[PDB]
From a paper:
A “cellular multitasker” with many binding partners, the scaffolding protein [name] is best studied in the context of histone methylation as part of the SET1/MLL (mixed-lineage leukemia) complexes. [name] comprises a 7-bladed β-propeller fold, each blade composed of a four-stranded antiparallel β-sheet (the WD40 motif). Cavities on each face, namely, the “[name]-binding motif” (WBM) and “[name]-interacting” (WIN) sites, are the interfaces key to its scaffolding role. The WIN site is dominated by a conserved arginine pocket, where the guanidine headgroup sits in a “phenylalanine clamp” composed of Phe133 and Phe263.
Considering that the alkyl chain of 1 contributed little to binding, initial efforts were directed at assessing whether an aromatic ring was tolerated at varying distances (0–3 atoms) from the imidazole fragment. While the zero atom linker showed little binding (13, KD = 5.2 mM), a linker length of one, two, or three methylene units was tolerated (14, KD = 530 μM, 15, KD = 300 μM, and 16, KD = 140 μM, respectively). Interestingly, the weakly binding fragment 13 is similar to the imidazole fragment hit reported by Wang et al. The subtle difference in orientation between the two series' imidazole rings appears key to avoid clashes with nearby residues S49 and I305. A cocrystal structure bound with 16 was solved, showing the introduced phenyl ring projecting into subpocket S4, toward residues A47, S49, A65, and L321 [Fig. 3(d)]. Despite the improved binding of 17, the initial addition of the phenyl ring was noted to constitute a sizeable drop in ligand efficiency from the initial hit (16, LE = 0.33; 17, = 0.35).
Residue numbers in the entry: 31 to 209, 214 to 334
Write the structure that this text describes.
């Protein structure tokens, strides 16, 4: 069985490169971040523009939702993160402490913590309520490309241009495991047993966290320059989804590693993809020659 993702909506509005798209956990919204210093909120199902959220002084590299879909966090070149009330569009907290661009961010499942990764080579853990930095992890020896909490928030996985993926005990900040090309993206599988890692040699790899071994390798896409998001699609067939520097969305069969679909339409690097939490829907977003978000729907 292969998916049949077809274009449903093109979301225009950003005036520079889109950096990240994420579906709200309740499935209602897509959030987009951009080099244009803005967050935009869109209807997940009708693609309808809802609102612009502004306040960062420089471009945004990443955005992430709280578990209840009420808050966003953004990571910016202004060296801050901002926590946003999505309903009001208001900045609740500015998280200050990184000494260079903040590149990546995520809430834990409880959504009492935010993890961030920075060009300053550190991973920070922040208290959402106070906006204060709880821990600074001397995580890497080059810019941090991705940070992600596992299913219960007990672990953080980080990746870096230093070629390392590290797994951190959230509660203590201690490194549990180091899992040489630059690692441009990492995240835990929904069940937290696997880590998906991108390297800037046109390769995605599925790792068994507990055993520390590579189970699957996905190739055929172009990825030598940008930190391109990748996803587990789990609503229908079990796919791996990624953007690509050849302007396509790549979908692989997770088990067989065969490319099952390439989605055409973007006119620049597909930097970010997201999979809808309940429906067979993909969001894709592209760099500055395109600047659009596309919503795609499949029957499986
Ligand atoms: O965790 C992987 C990750 C986070 N953010 C990105 C996108 C980087 C590209 C980009 C940056 C700033 C403006 C426009 C585009 N990848
Ligand atoms: Cl996620």
């Amino acid at each position: 069985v292969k998916p049949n993702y077809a274009l449903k909506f093109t979301l225009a509005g950003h005036t520079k490169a889109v950096s990240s798209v994420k579906f709200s956990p309740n499935g209602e919204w897509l959030a987009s971040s951009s080099a244009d210093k803005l967050i935009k909120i869109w209807g997940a199902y009708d693609g309808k523009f809802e609102k612009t959220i502004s306040g960062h002084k420089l471009g945004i590299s990443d955005v992430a939702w709280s578990s209840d879909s009420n808050l966003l966090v953004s990571a910016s070149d202004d060296k801050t993160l901002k926590i946003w009330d999505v309903s009001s569009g208001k900045c609740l907290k500015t998280l200050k402490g990184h000494s260079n661009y903040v590149f990546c961010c995520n809430f834990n499942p409880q959504s009492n913590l935010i993890v961030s990764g920075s060009f300053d080579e550190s991973v920070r853990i922040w208290d959402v309520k106070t906006g204060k930095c709880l821990k600074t992890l001397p995580a890497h020896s080059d810019p941090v490309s991705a940070v992600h909490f596992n299913r219960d928030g007990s672990l953080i996985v980080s990746s870096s241009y230093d070629g390392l993926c590290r797994i951190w005990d959230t509660a203590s900040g201690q490194c549990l495991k180091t899992l040489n090309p630059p690692v441009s993206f990492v995240k835990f599988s929904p069940n937290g047993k696997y880590i998906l890692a991108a390297t800037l040699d046109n390769t995605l790899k599925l790792w068994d966290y507990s055993k520390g071994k590579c189970l699957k390798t996905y190739t055929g896409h172009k990825n030598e320059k940008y930190c391109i998001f990748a996803n587990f699609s789990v609503t229908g067939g079990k796919w791996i989804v990624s953007g690509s520097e050849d302007n396509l969305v790549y979908i692989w069969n997770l088990q067989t590693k065969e490319i099952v679909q390439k989605l055409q339409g973007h006119t620049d690097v597909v930097i970010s993809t997201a999979c809808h939490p309940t429906e067979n829907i993909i969001a894709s977003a592209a760099l500055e020659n395109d600047k659009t978000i596309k919503l795609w729907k499949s029957d499986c």
